[PDB]
Amino acid sequence: PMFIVNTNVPRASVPDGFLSELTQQLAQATGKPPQYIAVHVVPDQLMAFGGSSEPCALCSLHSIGKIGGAQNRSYSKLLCGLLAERLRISPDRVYINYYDMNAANVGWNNSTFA
Amino acid sequence: PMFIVNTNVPRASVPDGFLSELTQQLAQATGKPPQYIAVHVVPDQLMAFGGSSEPCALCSLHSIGKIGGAQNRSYSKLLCGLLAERLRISPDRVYINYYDMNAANVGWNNSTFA
Amino acid sequence: PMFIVNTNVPRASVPDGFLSELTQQLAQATGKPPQYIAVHVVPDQLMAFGGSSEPCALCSLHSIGKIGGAQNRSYSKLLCGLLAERLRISPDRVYINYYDMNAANVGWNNSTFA
Numbered sequence: 234p235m236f237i238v239n240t241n242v243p244r245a246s247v248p249d250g251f252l253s254e255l256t257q258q259l260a261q262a263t264g265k266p267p268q269y270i271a272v273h274v275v276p277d278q279l280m281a282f283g284g285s286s287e288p289c290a291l292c293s294l295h296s297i298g299k300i301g302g303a304q305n306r307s308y309s310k311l312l313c314g315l316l317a318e319r320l321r322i323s324p325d326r327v328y329i330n331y332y333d334m335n336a337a338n339v340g341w342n343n344s345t346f347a
Numbered sequence: 348p349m350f351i352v353n354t355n356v357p358r359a360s361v362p363d364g365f366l367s368e369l370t371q372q373l374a375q376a377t378g379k380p381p382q383y384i385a386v387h388v389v390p391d392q393l394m395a396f397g398g399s400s401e402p403c404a405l406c407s408l409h410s411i412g413k414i415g416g417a418q419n420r421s422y423s424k425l426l427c428g429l430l431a432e433r434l435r436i437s438p439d440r441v442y443i444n445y446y447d448m449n450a451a452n453v454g455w456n457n458s459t460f461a
Numbered sequence: 462p463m464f465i466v467n468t469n470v471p472r473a474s475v476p477d478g479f480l481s482e483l484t485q486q487l488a489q490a491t492g493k494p495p496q497y498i499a500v501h502v503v504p505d506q507l508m509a510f511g512g513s514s515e516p517c518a519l520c521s522l523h524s525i526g527k528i529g530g531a532q533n534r535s536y537s538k539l540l541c542g543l544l545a546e547r548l549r550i551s552p553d554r555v556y557i558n559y560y561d562m563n564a565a566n567v568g569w570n571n572s573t574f575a
């Protein structure tokens with residue numbers, strides 16, 4: 234999978250090791266090899282949640298399979314847990330969009346995964 | 348719903364109060380309490396629209412339902428109108444991608460909306 | 462169509478003609494007039510691919526049709542080629558997500574493309 238988090242938390246509040254932690258925990262959660270996991274953290278964003286600029290995050294998780302009802306509830310628990318612990322963002326100020334990608338619609342290494 | 352704007356307009360040209368105006372106007376247009384609305388504005392972007400670096404915007408609106416032909420036209424008039432008035436972006440230099448999200452594919456507060 | 466590239470490559474390493482080159486190459490490759498093509502490059506990103514912070518890129522291509530198996534493979538060879546030549550990113554550290562948008566789900570000019 235590919236995990237993107239946009240947040241109004243400042244860059245200096247993103248701890249050392251965060252990208253590696255996300256990579257490792259997504260590998261653990263999805264069972265997928267870390268060598269194909271991509272993570273992207275975008276701090277200092279101009280955003281509001283419910284009209285408030287208290288800490289919040291808008292995230293997305295794209296996966297070729299491993300997306301579904303129970304899996305997504307599990308990912309949300311995991312990922313909100315990590316954002317709360319490491320970036321001090323309340324889980325009720327986080328949205329995560331999940332996308333099940335067709336392999337033919339993911340390009341990589343001059344081709345696609347089809 | 349969640350509304351994201353990426354634009355080459357500089358930060359200093361985003362007016363004070365713009366995130367609140369977007370929240371209010373989206374709540375009114377969708378008939379939803381502002382507590383459910385998230386907004387995100389990303390200025391100073393390196394982008395081109397039709398080969399031109401004149402002011403432009405690439406946006407997205409994600410909603411669990413309430414997406415379709417007529418509603419999307421109405422959102423586009425509202426949102427292009429706001430971007431023209433507040434950021435001085437011509438409506439024909441705006442793209443808005445509309446996404447009808449399944450509740451099971453939106454995470455919030457350690458779970459999903461399913 | 463709309464092409465977005467997020468990358469950890471620094472802003473200074475993006476050649477000055479890069480947006481125009483993307484616009485022209487995508488117009489050639491998609492058979493669309495360049496007036497319809499939007500391009501967006503986001504450097505200096507905090508991202509990792511396979512746990513590594515070597516240069517990498519996470520991209521997307523949105524089109525109303527002109528998306529599918531062989532077409533996406535051709536787009537990936539073209540776009541990986543440009544990212545390797547111009548930004549010095551290895552093709553095996555690039556993801557490109559392809560999205561076939563319905564015309565009624567793309568807003569533009571106060572309406573949609575429906």
Ligand SMILES: O=C(O)c1cc(-c2cn[nH]c2)ccc1Oc1ccc2ccccc2c1
Nearest residue numbers: 328330348349383409410411448450453460
């Ligand atoms: O208003 C929306 O559709 C909406 C959209 C997002 C969102 C965030 N990322 N992508 C979409 C989040 C919250 C939202 O409020 C809800 C939330 C649950 C619902 C469940 C059933 C019906 C309607 C709902 C509405």
